[PDB]
Write a protein that binds this ligand. Structure first.
Ligand code: HEM
Ligand SMILES: O=C1N[C@@H](Cc2ccc(O)c(Br)c2)C(=O)N[C@H]1Cc1ccc(O)cc1
Length: 393
């Protein structure tokens, strides 16, 4: 037999039994990735947290030439260090402030957009596709608003994402074509006097402030492309797979419909059980480090399996059940942990909370319109998502 291959399954509606078996028997284990490289797969909560909290397991160094790779880069190697570059430029605080869900009227815009999308699906009649005609457009509209760019430019930027977030064994020619085009777009945005709000409006002002005169135009444009792409793919894919988990739990769907004040706690549990990340989070050891029973050596690749941690019964008893009264509800790893913890975590929560609130009000009887096994799971991608999510109500 050949060495165990990752990823185990592209399905986002069920966790393979192999995960709990590995976690119990071999919570750090050698595997082979799609590139042919070997890596250490970490699958318990305790070891996942250890890796993510030790900066000697480096994100930036995953991009080094000659390193064992989870997958091929779809961005320039410097962009793997995006958050470090933002910090070095003195821009971290300003970026964080621009992506909070607390801007005036942002939540009202999200509710208005979600309700408009749902009204259009109702008018058209069932079946409706909740990914392509709800979750993704809501994510795209949110990110255009947060960035300050025209809503009408969302669709073209969005069309780059089915390639940009591929998890490929080899470089992707289309990823470069789309990247260069999207960078050119954001560079034009920085020069566009109509763009005065949101993240791009703020970056456009900082760009002309003397305290930032030597920050490169490349970085300013890159911030726009990366925050659009990462935010849209992550929120769209999370909401889509959360809606599946909700539809498959009619008792919970009815509880949240009747008591919407529980939606935040329900979204936190949906984050915990979410299988949206298709691969473990990659890190390269910069030193020899003991992790459980394995001495990881300098230069080796480690993969932090989020669902390994989030379904670990030693941390979350009865892990496959959504329970709204856990004592450790936000201690999941859905947004990562440590140096690279997701900077858009609050916006991602609010996107999902508002999307679910609106859906349950407009379509309280929402149900799958096809048997669940008929969903088509995207392969070789950095997220797990169904190509279409057909529902009736
Ligand atoms: C539910 C939605 C979201 C989920 C589940 C999610 C998940 C994650 C995870 C797990 C990481 C850690 C990656 C790693 O450590 O290797 C991360 C990082 C990141 N996320 Fe999110 N995310 C979401 C929403 C967003 C949003 C809305 C934005 C921006 C608008 C965003 C931007 C980023 C960026 C830029 C990073 C990289 C941070 C860094 O390298 O230090 N995410 N996200
Ligand atoms: O900001 C970043 N940090 C790192 C780490 C990272 C990688 C994949 C993700 O899913 C997440 Br989330 C984080 C990076 O390599 N790239 C960007 C995200 C990004 C944006 C647009 C793209 O086309 C491709 C990647």
């Amino acid at each position: 037999t050949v060495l165990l291959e990752v990823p185990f399954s592209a399905r986002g509606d069920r966790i393979p039994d192999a995960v709990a078996e590995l976690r119990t028997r071999e919570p750090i284990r050698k595997v082979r990735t799609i590139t042919g490289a070997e890596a250490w797969l970490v699958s318990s909560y305790a070891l996942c947290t250890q890796v993510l909290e030790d900066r000697r397991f480096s994100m930036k160094e995953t991009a080094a030439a000659g390193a064992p790779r989870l997958n091929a880069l779809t961005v320039p190697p410097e962009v793997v260090n995006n958050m470090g570059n933002i910090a070095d430029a003195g821009l971290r605080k300003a970026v964080m402030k621009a992506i909070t869900p607390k801007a005036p009227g942002l939540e009202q815009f999200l509710r208005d957009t979600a309700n408009s999308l749902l009204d259009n699906l109702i008018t058209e009649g069932a079946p409706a596709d909740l990914r392509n005609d709800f979750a993704d457009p809501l994510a795209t509209a949110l990110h255009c608003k947060v960035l300050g760019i025209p809503q009408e430019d969302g669709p073209k930027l969005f069309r780059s994402l089915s390639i940009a977030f591929m998890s490929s064994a080899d470089p992707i020619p289309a990823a470069k074509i789309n990247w260069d085009r999207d960078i050119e777009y954001m560079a034009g945005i920085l020069e566009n006097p109509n763009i005065t709000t949101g993240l791009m409006g703020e970056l456009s002002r900082l760009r002309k402030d003397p305290a930032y005169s030597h920050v490169s135009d490349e970085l300013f444009a890159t911030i726009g492309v990366t925050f659009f792409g990462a935010g849209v793919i992550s929120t769209g894919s999370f909401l889509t797979t959360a809606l599946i988990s909700l539809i498959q739990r009619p008792q919970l769907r009815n509880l949240l419909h009747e008591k919407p004040e529980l939606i935040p706690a329900g979204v936190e549990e949906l984050l915990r059980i979410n299988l949206s990340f298709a691969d473990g989070l990659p890190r390269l050891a910069t030193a020899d480090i003991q992790v459980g029973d394995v001495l990881v050596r300098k230069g080796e690749l480690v993969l932090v399996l989020l669902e390994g941690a989030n379904f670990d019964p030693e941390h979350f008893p009865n892990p496959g059940s959504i329970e709204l009264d856990r004592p450790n509800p936000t201690s999941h790893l859905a947004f990562g942990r440590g140096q690279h913890f997701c900077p858009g975590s609050a916006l991602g929560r609010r996107h999902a909370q508002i999307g679910i609130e609106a859906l349950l009000k407009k379509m309280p009887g929402v149900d799958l319109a096809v048997p669940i096994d008929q969903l088509v799971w995207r392969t070789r991608f950095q997220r797990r998502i169904p190509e279409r999510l057909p529902v009736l109500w």
